[PDB]
Structure 1
Amino acid sequence: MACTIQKAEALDGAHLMQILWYDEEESLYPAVWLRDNCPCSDCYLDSAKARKLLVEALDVNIGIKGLIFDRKKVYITWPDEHYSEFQADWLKKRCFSKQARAKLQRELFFPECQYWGSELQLPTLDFEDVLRYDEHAYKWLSTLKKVGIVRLTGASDKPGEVSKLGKRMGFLYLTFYGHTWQVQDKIDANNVAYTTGKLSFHTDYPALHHPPGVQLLHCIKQTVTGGDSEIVDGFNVCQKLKKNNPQAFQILSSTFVDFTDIGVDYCDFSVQSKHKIIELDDKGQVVRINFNNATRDTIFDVPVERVQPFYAALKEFVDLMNSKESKFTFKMNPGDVITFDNWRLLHGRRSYEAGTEISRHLEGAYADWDVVMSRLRILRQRVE
């Protein structure tokens, strides 16, 4: 009833098509949009699922010259004698009503978000199951998107496990630190992460204008002397900050902070960026946190009078993150892999003791959210 055509007609000087569906709901489709989206072989390359029609070929003042229909299709003639057919189900999906557009956006981008604090139950799946079964890999990426973190247990205690997960997703995101990288204490460390020091809450790689969307960390070796993990839900924290200190939120969401990374690893590098620590979309919603206190530059590109208020705001944000109601602490064992949203979560590590042998070794990698989302879309289709 809902996707069967009861009537189709051209309206508004023939600039709109109206469909009355068999449930009595109506949908409206601008003529210019219909013409732009003609699925014929002249206009559309089926092997690519892509538009061949050029903007230059589109008459933006076009109207429908003739229309007939049956229950499942509309058949249109255009003023220049071009001819198009549209399927009812295809039309129904693309209905310009707010409800229809919103449903479809939800299907494309999986916006469902579950905020959490210290009560978090760490979502956990088996490593080999995720590699082997689409049902398990689907639960993995869907939960990663919704909650922001999934622990995978039962991987080996040798290098190469993150690279498997990389292939399962698609491919990993190369940076100056390598295709994958080893978190261990290193002589002449090129990064604070490669020491035994504490890492306070941070996101990885704000020195890039497009920080890694997803991070993977695999525990090869763990130390008993410290090195526990800590995470916080940055979107939850930002919401709390906006309520408790709107001025602190305003400053952190509007001030461009410079980040820097200079050194040598996979290649020699001298990297500089600017980010707002709390990054909002055009509707004021938080979409990314960009903050690593190690790589925040000494250079600070703001008028003098804005400096101390910035630091006061940063301090409030960091104190919120550290609150016992916000943070979740846990410890990785060998064979554990954590995979998390590096745009939303902030993560940290407790200091541990240095010594002559390597007491602690994680292998890590990054993936682009678009690569992850692509796999998520494909997995959903295969599982449903």
Structure 2
Amino acid sequence: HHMPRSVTADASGSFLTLTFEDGSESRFHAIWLRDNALDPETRSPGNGQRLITIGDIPADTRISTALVDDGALTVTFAPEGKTVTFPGKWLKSNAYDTDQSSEVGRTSPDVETWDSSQPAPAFDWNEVQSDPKAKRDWLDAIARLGFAKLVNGPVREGALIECASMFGFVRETNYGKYFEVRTEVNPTNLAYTGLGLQAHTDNPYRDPVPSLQILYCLENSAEGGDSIVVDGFRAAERLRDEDPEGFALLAGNPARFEYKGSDGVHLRARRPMIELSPDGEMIAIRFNNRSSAPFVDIPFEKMEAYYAAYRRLGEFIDDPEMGVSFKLEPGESFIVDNTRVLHARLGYSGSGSRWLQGCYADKDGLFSTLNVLNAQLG
């Protein structure tokens, strides 16, 4: 099935049809094959960079001659007269003559959505540093599920920056490379500190949104206040399955977010609460009650139904059965994919203090590190 058997070219030379040993067929256009040639004059052997532009490829490029031999495809292009070969495995892996799904709001096959039945993934600080398999599994959990907990870390200021550096790079803001989250819980504030905060993604007013968030515990002597995570993709899925028109409104119209502090910070963004790829795949969630700004982009005739959908998404986010809760002891931390997984805490149940440190990092670095680890372990 990854082993090519034979090939036929069209009389035009505009495409060819590759038949594999299992009977399956896959068609490839001449232009696509020429642009994706893997030979040293198309792709630099040293760095993999393509050496030619689309403009460099003759617009009348066609397949002149083609043949399957010993697991590979030989193709010669006219009018260049250029012969290249493609390994069979590569052609199958990079095929586009497939039945690509067009389901609106579908999740990527790489991710798995969850509710309160999902245990919090937990990994050991020392093991992820010394065991590449543990590191791979830690980062893979953040990739697939959008969060993971790291335990047995050092009780040291700035330790979260060391965590970030294990896979990527910190998104520095006006607040610094990291920020302090100090809480004092006492009878004078327990009326409000004793209630939970609505789950949210951080900084939807930043474009580009910081794509990972790390929260790291240094001190905890206050009862309750468990951290909680909610899968924005699951909330969005539930809306879509119940109410596809409401989902389409939240995906089809941008919201506005703003943070205009008294500390000389003024951040604004214009993005939808549910962000889809142009072919319908769900790629990001932005939900934060505190920084939502006037919605000026939604037409008058859609505003009521938009608000109804918005309210419904909030109910799914507020649903106790959607939240995964956990304790953070000193030296423990968690990361969330801040383009997907919302976070908050439950109410505090007793007096004391807490000291967390917070920072942002970016997913591209995490995915790169994961890719490198998979290649090293594969």
Scaled to the shorter chain, the TM-score interval is: 0.7 to 0.9
Q: Assess if the C-alpha contact under 8 Å between 1:213 and 1:366 holds in 2.
A: yes
Q: TM-score, normalised by structure 2?
A: 0.83
Aligned to 2:92: 92
What is the distance in 2 between the residues matched to 1:217 and 1:134? Answer: 23
Q: Assess if the C-alpha contact under 8 Å between 1:32 and 1:59 holds in 2.
A: no
Q: Deviations over 1:330-358 (max 9, x none)?
A: 22111111112212221112455999xx9
What is the distance in 2 between the residues matched to 1:369 and 1:144? Answer: 9
Could you tell me the percent identity over the aligned residues? 27
SS in structure 2 at match of 1:221:
strand
Aligned to 2:214: 216
What is the distance in 2 between the residues matched to 1:85 and 1:289? Answer: 43
Would the alpha carbon gap of residues 212 and 84 (structure 1) be closer, same or farther in structure 2, given more than 3 Å must change?
A: same
What is the distance in 1 between the residues matched to 2:272 and 2:111? Answer: 22
Aligned to 2:334: 338
Q: 1:82 is matched by which residue type in structure 2?
A: G
Would the alpha carbon gap of residues 279 and 10 (structure 1) be closer, same or farther in structure 2, given more than 3 Å must change?
A: closer
Aligned to 1:379: 373
Aligned to 1:363: 357
What is the distance in 1 between the residues matched to 2:318 and 2:65? Answer: 66
Q: Which runs of 5+ in 1 are unaligned?
A: 103-108, 187-194
Would the alpha carbon gap of residues 311 and 226 (structure 1) be closer, same or farther in structure 2, given more than 3 Å must change?
A: farther
Count, aligned residues = 364
Shift of 1:176: 2.8
Q: Deviations over 1:203-243 (max 9, x none)?
A: 01100122122211111112315432122122212222334
What is the distance in 1 between the residues matched to 2:36 and 2:301? Answer: 54
SS in structure 2 at match of 1:66:
strand
Would the alpha carbon gap of residues 59 and 308 (structure 1) be closer, same or farther in structure 2, given more than 3 Å must change?
A: closer
Aligned to 1:192: none
Would the alpha carbon gap of residues 238 and 84 (structure 1) be closer, same or farther in structure 2, given more than 3 Å must change?
A: same
Q: How does 1:7-86 map to 2 (within 5 A)?
A: 7-67=6-66, 70-86=69-85
Q: Deviations over 1:48-88 (max 9, x none)?
A: 20211122221232223334553144444433453222132
Please identify, of 133-142 and 245-254, the stretch whose mean Cα deviation from structure 2 is larger: 245-254
Please identify, of 319-328 and 75-84, the stretch whose mean Cα deviation from structure 2 is larger: 75-84
Q: 1:332 is matched by which residue type in structure 2?
A: L
Residue 314 of structure 2 corresponds to residue 318 of structure 1: yes
Q: Which runs of 5+ in 2 are unaligned?
A: 102-106, 185-192
Would the alpha carbon gap of residues 214 and 196 (structure 1) be closer, same or farther in structure 2, given more than 3 Å must change?
A: farther
Aligned-residue RMSD, C-alpha: 3.2
SS in structure 2 at match of 1:51:
coil
Q: TM-score, normalised by structure 1?
A: 0.82
SS in structure 2 at match of 1:253:
helix
Q: Assess if the C-alpha contact under 8 Å between 1:261 and 1:295 holds in 2.
A: yes
Would the alpha carbon gap of residues 31 and 286 (structure 1) be closer, same or farther in structure 2, given more than 3 Å must change?
A: closer
Please identify, of 341-350 and 66-75, the stretch whose mean Cα deviation from structure 2 is larger: 66-75
